[PDB]
Design a protein around this ligand. Sequence first.
Ligand SMILES: CO[C@H]1[C@H](O)[C@@H](O)[C@@H](O)O[C@@H]1C(=O)O
Ligand SMILES: CO[C@H]1[C@H](O)[C@@H](O)[C@@H](O)O[C@@H]1C(=O)O
Ligand SMILES: [Co+2]
Ligand SMILES: [Co+2]
Ligand SMILES: [Co+2]
Ligand SMILES: [Co+2]
Ligand SMILES: [Co+2]
Ligand SMILES: [Co+2]
Ligand SMILES: [Co+2]
Ligand SMILES: [Co+2]
Ligand SMILES: [Co+2]
Ligand SMILES: [Co+2]
Lengths: 701, 700
Amino acid sequence: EDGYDMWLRYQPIADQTLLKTYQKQIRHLHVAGDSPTINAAAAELQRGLSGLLNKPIVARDEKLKDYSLVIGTPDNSPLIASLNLGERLQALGAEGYLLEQTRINKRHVVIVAANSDVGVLYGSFHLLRLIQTQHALEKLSLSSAPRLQHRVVNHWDNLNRVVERGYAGLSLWDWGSLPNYLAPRYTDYARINASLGINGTVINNVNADPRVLSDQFLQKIAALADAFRPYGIKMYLSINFNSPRAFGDVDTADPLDPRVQQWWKTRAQKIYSYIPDFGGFLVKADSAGQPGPQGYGRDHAEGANMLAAALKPFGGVVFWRAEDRFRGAYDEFMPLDGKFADNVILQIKNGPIDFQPREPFSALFAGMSRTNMMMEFQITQEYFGFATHLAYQGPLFEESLKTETHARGEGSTIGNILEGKVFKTRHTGMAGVINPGTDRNWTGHPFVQSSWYAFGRMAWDHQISAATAADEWLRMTFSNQPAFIEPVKQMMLVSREAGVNYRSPLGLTHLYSQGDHYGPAPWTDDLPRADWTAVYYHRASKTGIGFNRTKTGSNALAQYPEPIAKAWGDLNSVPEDLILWFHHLSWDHRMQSGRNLWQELVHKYYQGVEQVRAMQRTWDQQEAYVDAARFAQVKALLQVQEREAVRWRNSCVLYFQSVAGRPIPANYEQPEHDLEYYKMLARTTYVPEPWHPASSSRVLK
Amino acid sequence: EDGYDMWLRYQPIADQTLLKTYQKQIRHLHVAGDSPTINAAAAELQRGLSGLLNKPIVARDEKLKDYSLVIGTPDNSPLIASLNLGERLQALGAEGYLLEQTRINKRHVVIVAANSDVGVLYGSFHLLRLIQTQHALEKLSLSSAPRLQHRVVNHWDNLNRVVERGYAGLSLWDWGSLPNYLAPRYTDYARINASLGINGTVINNVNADPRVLSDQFLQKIAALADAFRPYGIKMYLSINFNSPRAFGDVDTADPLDPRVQQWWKTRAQKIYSYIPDFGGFLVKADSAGQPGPQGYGRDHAEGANMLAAALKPFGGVVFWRADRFRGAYDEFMPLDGKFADNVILQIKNGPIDFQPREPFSALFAGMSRTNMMMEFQITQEYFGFATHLAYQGPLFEESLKTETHARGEGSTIGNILEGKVFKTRHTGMAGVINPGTDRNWTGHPFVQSSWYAFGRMAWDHQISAATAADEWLRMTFSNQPAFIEPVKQMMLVSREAGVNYRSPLGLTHLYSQGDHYGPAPWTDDLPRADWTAVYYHRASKTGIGFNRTKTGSNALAQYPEPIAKAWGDLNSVPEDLILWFHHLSWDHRMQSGRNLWQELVHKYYQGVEQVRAMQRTWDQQEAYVDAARFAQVKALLQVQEREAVRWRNSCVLYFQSVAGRPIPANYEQPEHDLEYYKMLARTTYVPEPWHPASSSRVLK
Ligand SMILES: CO[C@H]1[C@H](O)[C@@H](O)[C@@H](O)O[C@@H]1C(=O)O
Ligand SMILES: CO[C@H]1[C@H](O)[C@@H](O)[C@@H](O)O[C@@H]1C(=O)O
Ligand SMILES: [Co+2]
Ligand SMILES: [Co+2]
Ligand SMILES: [Co+2]
Ligand SMILES: [Co+2]
Ligand SMILES: [Co+2]
Ligand SMILES: [Co+2]
Ligand SMILES: [Co+2]
Ligand SMILES: [Co+2]
Ligand SMILES: [Co+2]
Ligand SMILES: [Co+2]
């Protein structure tokens, strides 16, 4: 195996007793419909059932045979219509489905039924997933519908095909041969995403290139959209707010200028002439040298609404990305609550800083009550070790979605807020920055596939656990052997926390080398902005560490609902895993463990390395259950991870020691090298990413 | 089929009668030896014979069975030794081999016999190739030995994994996971190269990163060298001449400074501790802001010899890379004889820079006391990146069979390289392949054929482009004669088509600078005139061409007298080179009867028609090719035709604007005007990750 199939591995069921049972239950595949989407579902079931059941199962439209899988909607399949599903289908809406073992004219059947063709597609993938994961079909009766409307992936891909925060190869999109060459991989990409119910893609970098709106590129993009359409995936583009100027058509991009308004309306007309079901726009504006409305003295609602007005006649939406930097997004956007148009959705990262290994929830989610919102999670491992560290992100996503905000009573979880139940809003969604590439296994590190998987599962149902998604993924990707699943599932579940522990435990954050983000640099000071440095966030000194965000410091806690401000502001109740986000504490503060804060910091850094070492031992125990190639690859990558984790640990412990002046407790292995040595390693250790200039650095001392 | 196997496709022989014959001839595989290299040969034969013959053939060391393939050297295989092959075998040297149907102890056998283990490996690949190309084994008796010593590939790969002039993905070398992860692909890379007898690789860019010589990277590089070693491929590195300074160890890199001499000696000792059979260095120096000896007021021999002295105790070599036309010749000729015996001057086929046709580099006929090797380009820097179909076999054949008259008749470029003209110590050729992580290694499927042809010609420089194409098509696509003939001819015309729609008649250097994707024959006003196009063509209202005769730059005087004579005389100069050497009036009448203006138009239009004919030919092959590669090549040919039209229109309209002559009415008038094509040059996507032009946001 080389990862190309990801979790859609349609190999014969290994449990021979179970295989025989499936073979008895599904002897035929009945498909009456013939739309592109139903055809895609039929093709997936034909290849999937044939592979899993080890016999030729061909989709046919013929008189119903005993022991058939029958798929369709009441509108395209008279067999489905005859069951008179009624209210049972009503609950499923536009994208849901019902899977059920039943009878049609005394024939034994399993149905995949829906209101829409895309619901049939999603249900077909779930039916395959039940078999892939060795679940029984006898007495099957289940229905499901997605809990969020816009379930999207994001690709930070430059048109030169280098991917920003891209650790898995070049951009999938081969502009040089588009629109002429419809590569099979474009269809495989659509299959991967549709298998999770992902229904949208933003294919181009948020650091946006205006060329994507030119005819030259719209023709190429349309060819991708055509490949994606049968699988239910709408096309979206990141836009450059200054495009009217870049195209030399208008001497300003001010959204209140009628010529600018018209430029975008005319451009939307052009887009929809190529892509009649185009989803809309992703916008990064006035952030990091990206142009925006504030460049013309206008606010973000004025800019978003101008774009939204251009898209509204075509049914498009705008995904608008949202002294103490922690306070920034909330302070910028809270005054605009209620000012955005109904087809604008504010796309907000899980936390207020930037995808750090642990962040508290973004206060905007509990504060904006009159604005559509959507979550943005990161899959690509910008902060979790590129393609060389194993870091299943399921637990990060779950932790986020199940976080209680107390916005409006108990049950105001991030997930319930996203679903729209808390504040009663129109558009809902989640976006996942996946940044795959042309590597054979799409994601570089095999385990990044598990993070993509969990994100799509959770976008469908935000209460799905990291454990459940890992169990599925492991079954689908590797093995159904219980003795494999349990230890590898636990290895996955600990991997995120390991990555917190050897980098920045206890509420520490932003300790990375700038701007490449591969390795440690907790000493970083003196950049163009203080909030780019590490020292700004940790504030370590001889007496203590941490950033005071209570009422006696920046009072960022007042940005949160009262119950959260209260819990996090009191040392007696604040979780230790967030503590240094909100409190500057003396090194002698005693933690729950009985250690002082210095000792606890050291313990966590050393624990992260030990957790990696334990993952290595776990993986080595699985040799009998995994193919030799992927086995060897993951074993090797875990060796790289352990070496880097040691570098992280030694770099940060020695750095913080240099500031606190306390000894590393004697039981721990003392670093043989000094802090200067680790500063030298930070300057000289290869940064394994094509995009960031640090990978080209010739510094050797 | 996704290209990953390239030409090593071990699928059952499609001709059922032939398949049965092979199955009767090779029923067993006998391998007595067990060195890493013999094991690699055995593994290749096991997978290849099993695939091709559609039955399990397992390498064994057991009592000889009737109808066996028996491989080895006299030293490792008593069966082979028992044949007492003597002089016939020994004459094939350290890399040659004998393939022969014979008998041993009354058993019917086919032997793969050699003097060395790598010779067994090479012969094993040829044995497989005979089967793959549906050649008969009955009465087989054939021997071969390579005609050049150093048969190397070059990769212009940056350590960030972006490839310079790289149109086939990221660099293969995954530095972030090395040395720990020995990816299967590293072994497959070695297999591909060893199947052609390629015995060296320079893995990193000539625009050299000094970190390759650090312990951090040497550890990584050694892991690659380890993967390559069983396949007979030595590791080489491009070096940065300023490394002593970059490492902070010396405040100069002057090769006459004893501290510099010692720095390189110590560094070589370090390298050879990691890689005991390290091949040596490739060097690009004092070229385009690359550091070199001239930066310290020293000459290229002083610089090369300093590096060479560091490598000599370990048996390593230095591949030193060599009116702009007269540059090279005038720079190295004074140094002929001044280079050490482990220095080899690596010279591009022509004096400019891999242009679609160039006259031979005069250095090849001039340097009579210096080791030389050829450098050819496979990656399509000047032939359309990964979107154009351009088999390069004809370019390499054209070069290698060129008579130079260096020491009278018989002084072909190939004979010079081989050491038959000037007595020499080291011989070779280097091929700039620049593959990457794309599934098919080369982006465009047909770039594989160029890599193939280069490897066959490095082994035997008299192999034709046609012979190499025949083999590659059989191995890669189909053995059906009705397929082979038209697709072979399509391949053979593809180079010339790429000359014709870009720069026929001796025109050159008409590309967009510095990305090189599209036309820009109007380019003037760069920091150096010899970067522009107009410098080369000198087009005016009265004529076109560059005078390199005795009345102009006299570059022809750099060639042997019979070439200077032939090319200086309008009566004998080949028309396909004419504007390299003569500035001619537009009314000059060509052999066709057209005037030069008319002939220029005819050639540009011919190139487009040649691409359209390639399209029609390919469409006729749908029955013989798998659906996926069929569709891919079909689509790429559409892109190529669109780009060829852009090239033709841009250049014809440009030259028209200068000559002020009409395009004859039997040619289709361009869709738009010259300004429109200047706009398309600014705005047409440049499909390469490396060159900054692919990031250009210019829209007008
Ligand atoms: C795509 O830009 C990224 C950027 O690479 C990273 O440094 C950070 O600033 O986040 C940005 C974002 O989320 O837009
Ligand atoms: C690798 O550098 C190349 C360069 O990309 C190209 O522009 C030309 O100058 O040739 C150089 C060379 O052959 O060294
Ligand atoms: Co994988
Ligand atoms: Co870039
Ligand atoms: Co919506
Ligand atoms: Co574990
Ligand atoms: Co202490
Ligand atoms: Co191919
Ligand atoms: Co680069
Ligand atoms: Co030699
Ligand atoms: Co043809
Ligand atoms: Co005329």
